Amino acid sequence: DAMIVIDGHGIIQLFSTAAERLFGWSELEAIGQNVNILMPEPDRSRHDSYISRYRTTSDPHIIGIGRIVTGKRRDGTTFPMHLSIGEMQSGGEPYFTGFVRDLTEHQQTQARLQEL
Numbered sequence: 370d371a372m373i374v375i376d377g378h379g380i381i382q383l384f385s386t387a388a389e390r391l392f393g394w395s396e397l398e399a400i401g402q403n404v405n406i407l408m409p410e411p412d413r414s415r416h417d418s419y420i421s422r423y424r425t426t427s428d429p430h431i432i433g434i435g436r437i438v439t440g441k442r443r444d445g446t447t448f449p450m451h452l453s454i455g456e457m458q459s460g461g462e463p464y465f466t467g468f469v470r471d472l473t474e475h476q477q478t479q480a481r482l483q484e485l
């Protein structure tokens with residue numbers, strides 16, 4: 370599915386090709402950008418703090434755990450997605466891998482069955 374790998378500062382290091390389709394951002398555009406360019410406010414501005422809370426407390430809030438959140442596409446549109454984070458380490462520094470599963474279709478179907 371879509372996969373994003375960030376370092377300990379929230380900077381994107383690898384943006385798979387499906388992520389490009391899903392978010393709109395190309396690989397070269399994504400890499401180097403902080404992951405918070407993928408979420409609306411208030412989380413955008415506080416996403417770094419969330420990561421900082423975890424790097425100092427060593428207390429996992431959403432690691433392993435799979436969570437449903439709102440992603441933001443390049444054209445400004447938000448959408449729900451399921452995200453699962455796996456923590457890793459390379460060259461001494463920590464890295465984080467996110468596996469996104471688009472849920473837009475599941476949210477639309479649900480709204481539709483609601484509406485009928």
Ligand code: HEM
Pocket residue numbers: 373374375404407408409412416419420422423428429430431432438439440441452454465466467
């Ligand atoms: C793109 C939509 C995203 C949103 C809305 C989002 C939102 C959040 C929120 C609200 C928190 C804190 C949750 C809590 O402490 O209970 C958090 C933590 C974090 N997020 Fe995200 N996130 C997004 C994507 C990502 C991605 C793609 C990565 C992939 C590496 C990632 C990695 C992290 C990490 C490492 C933390 C800290 C985890 C922790 O405190 O346990 N996030 N995120």
